[PDB]
């Protein structure tokens, strides 16, 4: 009705999901940017797979596109940073601080400085704004709740969160119809023929 292509992607997504090609599904969601899969997102956030989380998000929004998407990224990279401090990997923490969090300095310069100074604390829970944190499992969960709201309110995701509903294997169903259209035109027909291929149209003879 509007894009043949967009609708077709949805059919393919369903097909892929049924065939249990898990990774393919989410790369297509990401690259097409037509559907954002919350369930997947939560799973990945809980697992702390941050590289993939940011990669998946990147199919939908950039970090500075709007204040919602900006807070989403900030929360994630903040959490990334705290986990590094918590495992006393200061090499990684500084790396995150420079590579990931510096972009937010443009906005709150002072905040960046404050976050930087967390490096020198015995335990970052000594900062009173972070005093309620710990452990990792719990912080992630608390943050996920916040992320969901931010995403749900973000204009760039707002019409992308609901999968269309289809009979199982709609793609396979359509494929079948294309074979019926092919065979119904051949003269003169067999009652029940064998399909040579999907690559080129069938006919009889």
């Amino acid at each position: 009705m509007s894009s043949l292509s967009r609708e077709l992607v949805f059919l393919i997504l369903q097909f892929l999901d049924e065939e249990k090609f898990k990774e393919t599904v989410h790369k297509l969601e990401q690259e097409s940017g037509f559907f954002f899969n919350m369930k997947y997102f939560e799973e990945k956030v809980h697992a702390g797979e941050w590289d993939e989380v940011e990669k998946y998000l990147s199919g939908f929004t950039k970090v500075d596109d709007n204040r919602y998407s900006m807070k989403i990224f900030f929360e994630i990279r903040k959490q990334k940073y705290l986990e590094a401090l918590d495992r006393h990997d200061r090499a990684k923490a500084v790396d995150i601080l420079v590579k990931d969090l510096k972009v937010f300095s443009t906005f709150n310069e002072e905040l960046y400085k404050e976050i930087t100074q967390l490096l020198t604390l015995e335990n970052f829970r000594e900062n009173e704004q972070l005093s309620k944190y710990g452990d990792t499992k719990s912080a992630r969960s608390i943050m996920l709740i916040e992320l969901k709201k931010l995403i749900e309110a973000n204009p760039l995701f707002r019409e992308k969160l609901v999968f269309p509903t289809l009979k199982a294997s709609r793609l396979r169903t359509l494929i079948n119809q294309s074979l019926n259209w092919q065979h119904q035109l051949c003269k003169n027909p067999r009652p029940n023929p064998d399909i040579k291929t999907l690559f080129t149209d069938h006919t009889c003879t």
């Binding site: 900006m70 900030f74 937010f104 709150n108 704004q129």
Partner: peptide, 10 residues
């Protein structure tokens, strides 16, 4: 209530 869109240690 309006979400918190701010950027701070909270």
């Amino acid at each position: 209530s309006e979400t918190e869109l701010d950027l701070a240690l909270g």
